[PDB]
């Protein structure tokens, strides 16, 4: 999938899987931006799965850190 200024969190969430939600999409957009990924086809399988793994760490970090 190409990433543009009009890419939505829903589009990135669906890229991750049908049970991913808007928060997953938002987090992954942040990761892809950090990595300067403008086309997810440029990723290896290992890289893509590593990014998904990291998005779930960040998700947990958010839920936990918001308590304080």
mmCIF file of N, CA and C in Angstrom, residues 5-67:
data_model
loop_
_atom_site.group_PDB
_atom_site.id
_atom_site.type_symbol
_atom_site.label_atom_id
_atom_site.label_comp_id
_atom_site.label_asym_id
_atom_site.label_seq_id
_atom_site.Cartn_x
_atom_site.Cartn_y
_atom_site.Cartn_z
ATOM 1 N N UNK A 5 -0.544 11.707 2.007
ATOM 2 C CA UNK A 5 -1.151 12.642 2.938
ATOM 3 C C UNK A 5 -2.619 12.336 3.216
ATOM 4 N N UNK A 6 -3.269 11.609 2.310
ATOM 5 C CA UNK A 6 -4.678 11.267 2.479
ATOM 6 C C UNK A 6 -4.905 9.866 3.011
ATOM 7 N N UNK A 7 -3.825 9.155 3.317
ATOM 8 C CA UNK A 7 -3.955 7.827 3.897
ATOM 9 C C UNK A 7 -4.653 7.941 5.239
ATOM 10 N N UNK A 8 -5.585 7.033 5.482
ATOM 11 C CA UNK A 8 -6.362 7.082 6.702
ATOM 12 C C UNK A 8 -5.908 6.017 7.686
ATOM 13 N N UNK A 9 -6.233 6.228 8.957
ATOM 14 C CA UNK A 9 -5.945 5.226 9.972
ATOM 15 C C UNK A 9 -6.696 3.938 9.675
ATOM 16 N N UNK A 10 -7.898 4.041 9.106
ATOM 17 C CA UNK A 10 -8.669 2.856 8.794
ATOM 18 C C UNK A 10 -7.984 2.020 7.703
ATOM 19 N N UNK A 11 -7.412 2.683 6.701
ATOM 20 C CA UNK A 11 -6.710 1.983 5.637
ATOM 21 C C UNK A 11 -5.480 1.259 6.180
ATOM 22 N N UNK A 12 -4.754 1.914 7.075
ATOM 23 C CA UNK A 12 -3.573 1.263 7.640
ATOM 24 C C UNK A 12 -3.978 0.143 8.592
ATOM 25 N N UNK A 13 -5.030 0.373 9.375
ATOM 26 C CA UNK A 13 -5.553 -0.696 10.231
ATOM 27 C C UNK A 13 -5.937 -1.931 9.413
ATOM 28 N N UNK A 14 -6.653 -1.729 8.310
ATOM 29 C CA UNK A 14 -7.077 -2.883 7.527
ATOM 30 C C UNK A 14 -5.887 -3.627 6.930
ATOM 31 N N UNK A 15 -4.842 -2.881 6.590
ATOM 32 C CA UNK A 15 -3.592 -3.472 6.123
ATOM 33 C C UNK A 15 -3.040 -4.454 7.164
ATOM 34 N N UNK A 16 -3.225 -4.130 8.440
ATOM 35 C CA UNK A 16 -2.709 -4.934 9.542
ATOM 36 C C UNK A 16 -3.579 -6.147 9.855
ATOM 37 N N UNK A 17 -4.857 -6.096 9.498
ATOM 38 C CA UNK A 17 -5.755 -7.207 9.753
ATOM 39 C C UNK A 17 -7.132 -6.738 10.167
ATOM 40 N N UNK A 18 -8.133 -7.579 9.941
ATOM 41 C CA UNK A 18 -9.519 -7.165 10.151
ATOM 42 C C UNK A 18 -9.882 -6.888 11.620
ATOM 43 N N UNK A 19 -9.070 -7.360 12.568
ATOM 44 C CA UNK A 19 -9.334 -7.087 13.982
ATOM 45 C C UNK A 19 -8.553 -5.879 14.493
ATOM 46 N N UNK A 20 -7.694 -5.317 13.648
ATOM 47 C CA UNK A 20 -6.988 -4.095 14.018
ATOM 48 C C UNK A 20 -7.982 -2.939 14.063
ATOM 49 N N UNK A 21 -7.758 -1.982 14.953
ATOM 50 C CA UNK A 21 -8.667 -0.849 15.071
ATOM 51 C C UNK A 21 -7.956 0.460 14.734
ATOM 52 N N UNK A 22 -8.659 1.576 14.911
ATOM 53 C CA UNK A 22 -8.139 2.882 14.523
ATOM 54 C C UNK A 22 -6.867 3.240 15.275
ATOM 55 N N UNK A 23 -6.763 2.789 16.521
ATOM 56 C CA UNK A 23 -5.573 3.068 17.303
ATOM 57 C C UNK A 23 -4.372 2.326 16.715
ATOM 58 N N UNK A 24 -4.567 1.070 16.332
ATOM 59 C CA UNK A 24 -3.516 0.313 15.663
ATOM 60 C C UNK A 24 -3.052 1.047 14.412
ATOM 61 N N UNK A 25 -4.015 1.541 13.638
ATOM 62 C CA UNK A 25 -3.698 2.246 12.417
ATOM 63 C C UNK A 25 -2.908 3.510 12.686
ATOM 64 N N UNK A 26 -3.332 4.276 13.687
ATOM 65 C CA UNK A 26 -2.640 5.508 14.035
ATOM 66 C C UNK A 26 -1.193 5.244 14.477
ATOM 67 N N UNK A 27 -1.019 4.229 15.309
ATOM 68 C CA UNK A 27 0.314 3.877 15.793
ATOM 69 C C UNK A 27 1.194 3.435 14.631
ATOM 70 N N UNK A 28 0.660 2.564 13.773
ATOM 71 C CA UNK A 28 1.437 2.081 12.641
ATOM 72 C C UNK A 28 1.786 3.229 11.686
ATOM 73 N N UNK A 29 0.886 4.190 11.500
ATOM 74 C CA UNK A 29 1.221 5.330 10.658
ATOM 75 C C UNK A 29 2.411 6.088 11.224
ATOM 76 N N UNK A 30 2.461 6.205 12.546
ATOM 77 C CA UNK A 30 3.577 6.857 13.212
ATOM 78 C C UNK A 30 4.877 6.096 12.995
ATOM 79 N N UNK A 31 4.816 4.768 13.088
ATOM 80 C CA UNK A 31 5.994 3.940 12.872
ATOM 81 C C UNK A 31 6.467 4.022 11.426
ATOM 82 N N UNK A 32 5.529 3.938 10.487
ATOM 83 C CA UNK A 32 5.882 4.010 9.078
ATOM 84 C C UNK A 32 6.518 5.362 8.748
ATOM 85 N N UNK A 33 6.017 6.425 9.368
ATOM 86 C CA UNK A 33 6.570 7.764 9.167
ATOM 87 C C UNK A 33 7.999 7.853 9.695
ATOM 88 N N UNK A 34 8.225 7.287 10.876
ATOM 89 C CA UNK A 34 9.562 7.245 11.454
ATOM 90 C C UNK A 34 10.533 6.551 10.506
ATOM 91 N N UNK A 35 10.067 5.457 9.915
ATOM 92 C CA UNK A 35 10.891 4.624 9.045
ATOM 93 C C UNK A 35 10.943 5.139 7.609
ATOM 94 N N UNK A 36 10.273 6.264 7.356
ATOM 95 C CA UNK A 36 10.201 6.862 6.019
ATOM 96 C C UNK A 36 9.698 5.882 4.977
ATOM 97 N N UNK A 37 8.720 5.080 5.366
ATOM 98 C CA UNK A 37 8.122 4.127 4.452
ATOM 99 C C UNK A 37 6.950 4.781 3.734
ATOM 100 N N UNK A 38 7.075 4.945 2.421
ATOM 101 C CA UNK A 38 6.001 5.540 1.629
ATOM 102 C C UNK A 38 5.296 4.492 0.777
ATOM 103 N N UNK A 39 5.816 3.270 0.809
ATOM 104 C CA UNK A 39 5.205 2.130 0.133
ATOM 105 C C UNK A 39 5.515 0.883 0.948
ATOM 106 N N UNK A 40 4.496 0.264 1.538
ATOM 107 C CA UNK A 40 4.747 -0.868 2.422
ATOM 108 C C UNK A 40 5.307 -2.082 1.675
ATOM 109 N N UNK A 41 5.211 -2.088 0.348
ATOM 110 C CA UNK A 41 5.834 -3.153 -0.439
ATOM 111 C C UNK A 41 7.358 -3.097 -0.372
ATOM 112 N N UNK A 42 7.896 -1.963 0.069
ATOM 113 C CA UNK A 42 9.345 -1.809 0.209
ATOM 114 C C UNK A 42 9.867 -2.532 1.453
ATOM 115 N N UNK A 43 8.956 -3.026 2.281
ATOM 116 C CA UNK A 43 9.333 -3.729 3.504
ATOM 117 C C UNK A 43 9.547 -5.215 3.263
ATOM 118 N N UNK A 44 10.533 -5.794 3.940
ATOM 119 C CA UNK A 44 10.641 -7.241 3.994
ATOM 120 C C UNK A 44 9.562 -7.798 4.911
ATOM 121 N N UNK A 45 9.343 -9.106 4.851
ATOM 122 C CA UNK A 45 8.375 -9.731 5.745
ATOM 123 C C UNK A 45 8.798 -9.539 7.198
ATOM 124 N N UNK A 46 10.087 -9.712 7.477
ATOM 125 C CA UNK A 46 10.601 -9.527 8.830
ATOM 126 C C UNK A 46 10.358 -8.113 9.319
ATOM 127 N N UNK A 47 10.599 -7.131 8.452
ATOM 128 C CA UNK A 47 10.414 -5.734 8.824
ATOM 129 C C UNK A 47 8.957 -5.425 9.107
ATOM 130 N N UNK A 48 8.064 -5.921 8.254
ATOM 131 C CA UNK A 48 6.636 -5.684 8.428
ATOM 132 C C UNK A 48 6.161 -6.285 9.745
ATOM 133 N N UNK A 49 6.536 -7.533 10.004
ATOM 134 C CA UNK A 49 6.120 -8.194 11.235
ATOM 135 C C UNK A 49 6.739 -7.532 12.464
ATOM 136 N N UNK A 50 7.972 -7.045 12.337
ATOM 137 C CA UNK A 50 8.606 -6.323 13.437
ATOM 138 C C UNK A 50 7.831 -5.041 13.760
ATOM 139 N N UNK A 51 7.380 -4.340 12.724
ATOM 140 C CA UNK A 51 6.609 -3.120 12.914
ATOM 141 C C UNK A 51 5.263 -3.426 13.552
ATOM 142 N N UNK A 52 4.608 -4.503 13.121
ATOM 143 C CA UNK A 52 3.361 -4.882 13.771
ATOM 144 C C UNK A 52 3.605 -5.183 15.253
ATOM 145 N N UNK A 53 4.652 -5.937 15.537
ATOM 146 C CA UNK A 53 4.991 -6.264 16.902
ATOM 147 C C UNK A 53 5.192 -4.983 17.710
ATOM 148 N N UNK A 54 5.940 -4.035 17.153
ATOM 149 C CA UNK A 54 6.197 -2.792 17.865
ATOM 150 C C UNK A 54 4.911 -2.002 18.079
ATOM 151 N N UNK A 55 3.995 -2.037 17.113
ATOM 152 C CA UNK A 55 2.756 -1.281 17.266
ATOM 153 C C UNK A 55 1.964 -1.781 18.474
ATOM 154 N N UNK A 56 2.066 -3.069 18.772
ATOM 155 C CA UNK A 56 1.308 -3.620 19.882
ATOM 156 C C UNK A 56 1.969 -3.281 21.222
ATOM 157 N N UNK A 57 3.294 -3.172 21.230
ATOM 158 C CA UNK A 57 4.019 -2.649 22.389
ATOM 159 C C UNK A 57 3.585 -1.214 22.678
ATOM 160 N N UNK A 58 3.588 -0.389 21.639
ATOM 161 C CA UNK A 58 3.185 1.004 21.783
ATOM 162 C C UNK A 58 1.726 1.131 22.244
ATOM 163 N N UNK A 59 0.853 0.279 21.718
ATOM 164 C CA UNK A 59 -0.544 0.254 22.148
ATOM 165 C C UNK A 59 -0.664 0.021 23.652
ATOM 166 N N UNK A 60 0.039 -0.999 24.130
ATOM 167 C CA UNK A 60 0.088 -1.302 25.559
ATOM 168 C C UNK A 60 0.666 -0.134 26.350
ATOM 169 N N UNK A 61 1.755 0.449 25.847
ATOM 170 C CA UNK A 61 2.374 1.612 26.482
ATOM 171 C C UNK A 61 1.352 2.735 26.657
ATOM 172 N N UNK A 62 0.520 2.955 25.643
ATOM 173 C CA UNK A 62 -0.446 4.043 25.707
ATOM 174 C C UNK A 62 -1.508 3.793 26.768
ATOM 175 N N UNK A 63 -2.084 2.596 26.781
ATOM 176 C CA UNK A 63 -3.135 2.281 27.744
ATOM 177 C C UNK A 63 -2.614 2.414 29.165
ATOM 178 N N UNK A 64 -1.411 1.897 29.391
ATOM 179 C CA UNK A 64 -0.796 1.927 30.708
ATOM 180 C C UNK A 64 -0.393 3.336 31.141
ATOM 181 N N UNK A 65 0.216 4.104 30.241
ATOM 182 C CA UNK A 65 0.750 5.412 30.617
ATOM 183 C C UNK A 65 -0.351 6.448 30.814
ATOM 184 N N UNK A 66 -1.524 6.184 30.252
ATOM 185 C CA UNK A 66 -2.639 7.119 30.365
ATOM 186 C C UNK A 66 -3.254 7.125 31.759
ATOM 187 N N UNK A 67 -3.070 6.034 32.495
ATOM 188 C CA UNK A 67 -3.603 5.927 33.850
ATOM 189 C C UNK A 67 -3.056 7.031 34.749
#
